[PDB]
Design a protein around this ligand. Structure first.
Ligand SMILES: Nc1ncnc2c1ncn2[C@@H]1O[C@H](COP(=O)(O)OP(=O)(O)O)[C@@H](O)[C@H]1O
Ligand SMILES: Nc1nc(=O)n([C@H]2C[C@H](O)[C@@H](CO)O2)cc1F
Ligand SMILES: [Mg+2]
Length: 229
């Protein structure tokens, strides 16, 4: 039916930059952006900034954040499936991140860093497993595009974007997130509770260079990659 591709990378690697060039390349391509502005002003579907709360006190707010982060993603991705506009000779749905990074990169890292205790960690995974059982098949990936950039490039791009909440993030934290992505998507040694992911095709794009100069080659590689799926 709808081909589903998720775009993965470190904080400020360039996912929104990349996402913003995709719709102009095929009118059959849709994008589900990550709801980060919604994490900064919590309201029902002004309020709490839950991203900021986590970063200011991660031992307190990581479980709450991670749980709300993932659910709001699921809601958003589901909304665009059943979201009418599909009917196209070749529909492709791009997800900015996935329930698998949420758990295997981000939540895992905070647990491993003592920001979630055993109880919190057990509840999260239990919730995440159940959520996948219900809405898992719907959201299964046909491919991953990994936007690879050094932690140091990312640190700099955090500065460039100037999002208030992310300005205090240390290189160390970005390095941990770097190595988890490399383990999952480069070496493919990170094991998950979802077997199909081990054979899912992966496109790796080195995005350390200037977006203007790399744009044309990246477009070629994305089209080339989609045609093999
Ligand atoms: N390849 C690139 N070359 C130059 N600047 C970039 C590149 N990719 C991203 N940026 C810049 O880096 C910052 C973060 O990019 P963004 O797309 O918001 O990252 P993400 O969406 O992955 O968090 C923004 O200032 C953006 O202008
Ligand atoms: N599961 C997640 N946990 C996080 O902590 N983030 C953070 C990273 C970045 O600072 C901001 C926007 O992605 O949210 C993003 C996730 F998807
Ligand atoms: Mg983004």
């Amino acid at each position: 039916r709808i081909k589903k591709i998720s775009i993965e990378g470190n904080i400020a690697a360039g996912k929104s930059t990349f996402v913003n060039i995709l719709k102009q390349l095929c009118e059959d391509w849709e994008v589900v952006p990550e709801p980060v502005a919604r994490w900064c002003n919590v309201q029902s579907t002004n309020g709490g900034n839950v991203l900021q709360m986590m970063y200011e006190k991660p031992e307190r707010w990581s479980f709450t954040f991670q749980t709300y982060a993932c659910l709001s993603r699921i809601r958003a991705q589901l909304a665009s499936l059943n979201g009418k506009l599909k009917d196209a000779e070749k529909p492709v749905l791009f997800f900015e991140r996935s329930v698998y990074s949420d758990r295997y990169i981000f939540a895992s890292n905070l647990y491993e860093s003592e920001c979630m205790n055993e109880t919190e960690w057990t509840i999260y995974q239990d919730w995440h497993d159940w959520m996948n059982n219900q809405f898992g098949q719907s959201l299964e990936l046909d491919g991953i595009i990994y936007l690879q950039a050094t932690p140091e490039t990312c640190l700099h791009r955090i500065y460039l974007r100037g999002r208030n909440e992310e300005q205090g993030i240390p290189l160390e934290y970005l390095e941990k997130l770097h190595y988890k992505h490399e383990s999952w998507l480069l070496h493919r040694t990170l094991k998950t509770n979802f077997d199909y992911l081990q054979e899912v095709p992966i496109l790796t794009l080195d995005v350390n260079e200037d977006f203007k100069d790399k744009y044309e080659s990246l477009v070629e590689k994305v089209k080339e990659f989609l045609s093999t799926l």
